[PDB]
Amino acid sequence: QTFGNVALGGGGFVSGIISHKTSGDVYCRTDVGGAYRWDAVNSKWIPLLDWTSENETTYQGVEALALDPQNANNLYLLAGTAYFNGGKTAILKSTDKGNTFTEVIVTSQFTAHGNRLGRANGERLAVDPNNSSILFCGTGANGLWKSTNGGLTWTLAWNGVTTTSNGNGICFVVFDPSSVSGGVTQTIYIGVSRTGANNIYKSTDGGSTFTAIQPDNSFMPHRAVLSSDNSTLYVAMADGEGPSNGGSGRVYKLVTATGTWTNITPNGNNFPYGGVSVDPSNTNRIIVSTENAWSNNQFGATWGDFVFFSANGGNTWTQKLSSTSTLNTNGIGWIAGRGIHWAGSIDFDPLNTARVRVISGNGIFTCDDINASATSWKFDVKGMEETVVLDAISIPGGSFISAVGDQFGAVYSNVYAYPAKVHTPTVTSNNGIAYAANNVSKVVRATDQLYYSTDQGATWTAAASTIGGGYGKIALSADGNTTLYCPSGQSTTYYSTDNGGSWTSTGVTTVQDACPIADYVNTNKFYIYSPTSGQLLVSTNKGVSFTASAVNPGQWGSGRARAVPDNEGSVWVALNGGGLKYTTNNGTSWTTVPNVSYCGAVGIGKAATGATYPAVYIWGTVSGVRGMFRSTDQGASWIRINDDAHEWGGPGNGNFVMGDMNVFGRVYMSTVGRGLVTIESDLSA
Ligand SMILES: OC[C@H]1O[C@@H](O[C@H]2[C@@H](OC[C@H]3O[C@@H](O[C@H]4[C@H](O)[C@@H](O)[C@@H](O)O[C@@H]4CO)[C@H](O)[C@@H](O)[C@@H]3O[C@@H]3O[C@H](CO[C@H]4OC[C@@H](O)[C@H](O)[C@H]4O)[C@@H](O[C@@H]4O[C@H](CO[C@H]5OC[C@@H](O)[C@H](O)[C@H]5O)[C@@H](O)[C@H](O)[C@H]4O)[C@H](O)[C@H]3O)OC[C@@H](O)[C@@H]2O)[C@H](O)[C@@H](O)[C@H]1O
Ligand SMILES: OC[C@H]1O[C@@H](O)[C@H](O)[C@@H](O)[C@@H]1O[C@@H]1O[C@H](CO[C@H]2OC[C@@H](O)[C@H](O)[C@H]2O)[C@@H](O[C@@H]2O[C@H](CO[C@H]3OC[C@@H](O)[C@H](O)[C@H]3O)[C@@H](O[C@@H]3O[C@H](CO[C@H]4OC[C@@H](O)[C@H](O)[C@H]4O)[C@@H](O)[C@H](O)[C@H]3O)[C@H](O)[C@H]2O)[C@H](O)[C@H]1O
Ligand SMILES: [Cl-]
Ligand SMILES: [Cl-]
Ligand SMILES: [Cl-]
Numbered sequence: 001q002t003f004g005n006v007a008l009g010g011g012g013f014v015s016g017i018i019s020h021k022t023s024g025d026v027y028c029r030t031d032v033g034g035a036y037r038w039d040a041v042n043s044k045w046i047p048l049l050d051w052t053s054e055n056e057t058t059y060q061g062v063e064a065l066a067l068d069p070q071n072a073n074n075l076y077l078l079a080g081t082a083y084f085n086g087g088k089t090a091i092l093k094s095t096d097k098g099n100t101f102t103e104v105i106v107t108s109q110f111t112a113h114g115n116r117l118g119r120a121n122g123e124r125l126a127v128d129p130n131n132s133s134i135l136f137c138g139t140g141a142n143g144l145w146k147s148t149n150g151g152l153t154w155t156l157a158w159n160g161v162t163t164t165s166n167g168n169g170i171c172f173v174v175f176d177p178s179s180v181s182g183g184v185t186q187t188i189y190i191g192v193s194r195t196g197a198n199n200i201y202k203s204t205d206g207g208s209t210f211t212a213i214q215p216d217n218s219f220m221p222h223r224a225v226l227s228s229d230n231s232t233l234y235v236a237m238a239d240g241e242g243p244s245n246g247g248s249g250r251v252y253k254l255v256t257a258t259g260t261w262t263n264i265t266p267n268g269n270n271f272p273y274g275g276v277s278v279d280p281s282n283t284n285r286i287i288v289s290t291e292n293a294w295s296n297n298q299f300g301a302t303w304g305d306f307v308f309f310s311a312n313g314g315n316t317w318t319q320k321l322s323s324t325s326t327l328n329t330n331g332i333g334w335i336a337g338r339g340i341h342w343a344g345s346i347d348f349d350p351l352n353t354a355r356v357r358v359i360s361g362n363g364i365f366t367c368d369d370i371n372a373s374a375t376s377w378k379f380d381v382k383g384m385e386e387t388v389v390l391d392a393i394s395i396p397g398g399s400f401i402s403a404v405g406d407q408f409g410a411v412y413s414n415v416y417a418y419p420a421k422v423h424t425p426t427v428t429s430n431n432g433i434a435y436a437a438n439n440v441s442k443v444v445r446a447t448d449q450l451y452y453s454t455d456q457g458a459t460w461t462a463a464a465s466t467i468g469g470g471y472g473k474i475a476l477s478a479d480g481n482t483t484l485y486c487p488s489g490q491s492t493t494y495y496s497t498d499n500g501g502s503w504t505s506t507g508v509t510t511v512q513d514a515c516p517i518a519d520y521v522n523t524n525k526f527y528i529y530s531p532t533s534g535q536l537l538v539s540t541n542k543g544v545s546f547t548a549s550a551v552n553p554g555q556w557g558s559g560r561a562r563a564v565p566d567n568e569g570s571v572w573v574a575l576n577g578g579g580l581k582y583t584t585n586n587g588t589s590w591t592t593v594p595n596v597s598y599c600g601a602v603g604i605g606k607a608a609t610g611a612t613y614p615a616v617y618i619w620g621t622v623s624g625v626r627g628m629f630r631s632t633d634q635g636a637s638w639i640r641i642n643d644d645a646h647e648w649g650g651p652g653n654g655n656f657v658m659g660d661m662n663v664f665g666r667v668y669m670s671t672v673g674r675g676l677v678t679i680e681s682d683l684s685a
């Protein structure tokens with residue numbers, strides 16, 4: 001209720017599906033946005049890692065997820081991202097299906113990178129099916145590790161493999177619990193993400209020594225699974241690790257009693273393969289998915305990977321995703337024309353193996369009846385949001401409009417309703433958006449080119465020219481007639497009085513990735529805060545020229561400063577470790593907000609009833625507590641409106657907080673991998 005998301009649905013890469021082969025619990029992991037449990041009672045995904053603080057953004061990268069065959073309550077994640085928090089890596093252990101976790105930091109022993117090449121391979125973390133206290137973990141670069149205390153500490157088990165050219169190392173670990181001594185499983189199979197050297201190994205002494213067994217080192221394994229009866233190991237492989245490389249591949253099966261490998265590649269098509277699943281009650285019933293194939297014209301509407309099913313252990317196969325399939329959008333209209341790609345994990349639902357889930361670069365798709373002649377695949381992403389949101393606007397009396405990486409963004413009359421369409425044309429992303437305060441039908445967005453709308457985002461027309469380059473931040477004057485624009489990666493802000501028919505430099509040439517801001521009241525006034533110089537630059541001639549204000553707010557803040565409705569000359573600046581300041585006089589002087597020792601982002605929203613100033617929202621540290629705070633009294637007092645369970649890793653790539661201008665208390669925040677989060681902070685009930 002209080003915490004949620006703008007509805008979009010999936011929109012990023014789910015890198016693995018893991019189900020409990022006895023209880024039927026289903027989970028997934030993602031590369032940039034944590035992990036989820038499928039709540040089959042309520043039919044929605046439940047995020048499990050929204051508690052990660054900004055000191056734990058790293059854990060949004062989930063490299064492996066393991067369940068305990070003997071106890072469905074246990075759940076383990078290997079979490080870490082190379083580029084956050086020093087690459088800090090942990091085993092995250094839960095005894096309650098992910099409702100709560102214990103953190104076991106392992107960085108100095110081994111690291112993980114959820115956004116690595118090879119990330120859909122797995123699972124490289126596994127629980128001994130005979131002994132809940134024993135886990136093994138293959139690592140990308142540090143060998144094979146084990147724990148004998150349920151994941152609390154780890155030791156090096158085997159180092160015959162450590163590093164590989166692709167950085168992905170040991171990429172699956174599978175136990176055969178038919179082989180046991182002293183209550184410790186003795187047979188372990190591992191896969192290694194390399195070609196031209198040994199890459200599938202078997203130990204029969206509990207992981208102390210391994211023997212190479214692969215039939216063809218031209219291909220590296222992605223995933224493997226052992227049938228419930230322990231008789232047959234199925235392996236998907238390709239000549240690259242995926243998800244976005246690999247040009248050919250195979251499916252193999254190993255009959256363990258005789259060590260017999262059979263090439264069961266569907267139709268000898270030799271596509272790159274990643275996903276494989278076996279029915280827990282039928283060794284011979286299997287399904288596979290290609291990974292990084294693109295020549296399947298799914299639904300007749302899109303291009304992506306293939307899915308093949310067999311009931312005879314791979315002797316013959318039937319396609320289960322093709323041009324005759326249909327896409328059930330499940331009320332999420334914008335997914336039409338998109339499909340299943342990077343399909344490096346596929347899973348029969350253990351409770352009913354007529355049902356199959358498959359991953360994709362844009363979410364997860366579910367076929368509830370794999371036996372149908374013309375299969376129906378549902379975009380099955382309720383509760384899941386994985387996009388990287390880059391900008392947004394909230395129009396008083398109008399729509400909320402997002403600018404999103406990969407899935408472009410949408411126009412919302414109800415932010416909790418799934419969009420029928422996303423902004424088109426877009427190339428890759430929209431990274432900036434603006435509207436005219438006194439001409440609210442006029443909106444502009446920045447992709448490879450600028451696009452203008454005269455109907456509040458419903459339709460778009462390209463600017464005649466987009467000066468400098470695309471993807472920059474943008475402002476529209478209050479009257480809508482002037483645009484200011486700084487191309488991404490460039491340091492000059494330009495102005496146009498004709499929707500980009502012509503451009504002229506503002507004279508501001510030294511603010512890289514400038515975020516120009518229009519005053520809401522005075523159509524001739526704009527501001528640019530420069531982190532490098534520490535200056536607030538102000539224009540009173542509609543962008544023709546700027547001057548620095550009398551007093552600098554200070555250096556090294558966020559470029560995303562905010563003007564204030566109904567308050568000409570007011571600007572709030574998030575100063576990072578310099579705190580939070582605001583001016584009411586165009587930067588002639590500044591108020592230091594007491595008790596704010598750090599502020600990463602500031603946004604404005606609808607005023608409280610009976611208040612005289614718009615509400616202010618920050619992501620920052622107030623009296624020593626980092627989180628989301630609201631002030632309804634112009635910064636004199638603050639209240640925390642998030643909680644320790646809802647931090648999401650902080651503001652992430654888009655680095656913004658913004659209030660809704662129509663719904664008091666509602667605030668939006670960007671994230672590294674959880675879409676656009678919302679807090680409905682008006683707790684009046
Ligand atoms: O090229 C395609 C290829 O990419 C591989 O992945 C690697 C690649 O990732 C790019 C971005 O991935 C994107 O996620 C995708 C995801 O992969 C998809 O599967 C799917 O789910 O969609 C998402 C979204 O599209 C991430 O969103 C994106 O963040 C990744 O880009 C990296 O971002 C890091 C974090 O920073 C950004 O977010 C926090 C903000 O505060 C930052 O402003 C913003 O940059 C970047 O790291 C940051 O880098 C700066 C500067 O670093 C530089 O200067 C100092 C030197 O010491 C550094 O070495 C030097 O790089 C740091 O100051 C900062 O501390 C750090 O956090 C990062 O540079 C940027 O690339 O690229 C990074 C690899 O790690 C990924 O493996 C895929 O594997 C592959 O399949 C294919 O897609
Ligand atoms: O014509 C049909 C088909 O015929 C085959 O025979 C041919 O080989 C195919 O190329 C062709 O299909 C088209 O394939 C490309 C990929 O092509 C590359 O790989 C195969 C090579 O043969 C070829 O030479 C290569 O050029 C597909 O492109 C991929 O599309 C997906 C999905 O894109 C959709 O969703 C995002 C939206 O922005 C797009 O408009 C929409 O189409 C992309 O996946 C998303 O990627 C981003 C991360 O981006 C980055 O990593 C990969 C890199 O290529 C890209 O440039 C980077 O930006 C993630 O955040 C998303 O989560 C993920 O879903 C791929 O990035 C992209 O390569 C064509 O769609 C397909 O029609
Ligand atoms: Cl269900
Ligand atoms: Cl299991
Ligand atoms: Cl159980």
Ligand SMILES: [Cl-]
Binds near residue numbers: 070130131132133
């Ligand atoms: Cl046990």
Ligand SMILES: [Cl-]
Binds near residue numbers: 149
């Ligand atoms: Cl103990």
Ligand SMILES: [Cl-]
Binds near residue numbers: 143159162
């Ligand atoms: Cl070593």
Ligand SMILES: [Cl-]
Binds near residue numbers: 164165193
């Ligand atoms: Cl190698």
Ligand SMILES: [Cl-]
Binds near residue numbers: 160208209210211
């Ligand atoms: Cl050995």
Ligand SMILES: [Cl-]
Binds near residue numbers: 228280
């Ligand atoms: Cl079986």
Ligand SMILES: [Cl-]
Binds near residue numbers: 202257258259260
């Ligand atoms: Cl064997």
Ligand SMILES: [Cl-]
Binds near residue numbers: 266267268315
């Ligand atoms: Cl065949």
Ligand SMILES: [Cl-]
Binds near residue numbers: 266267269
């Ligand atoms: Cl085929």
Ligand SMILES: [Cl-]
Binds near residue numbers: 292
């Ligand atoms: Cl292909």
Ligand SMILES: [Cl-]
Binds near residue numbers: 317318319
């Ligand atoms: Cl077929």
Ligand SMILES: [Cl-]
Binds near residue numbers: 302337338339340341
């Ligand atoms: Cl697609």
Ligand SMILES: [Cl-]
Binds near residue numbers: 400
């Ligand atoms: Cl709304």
Ligand SMILES: [Cl-]
Binds near residue numbers: 334422424
């Ligand atoms: Cl659309």
Ligand SMILES: [Cl-]
Binds near residue numbers: 438439440441
């Ligand atoms: Cl208006």
Ligand SMILES: [Cl-]
Binds near residue numbers: 452461462463499
């Ligand atoms: Cl126009």
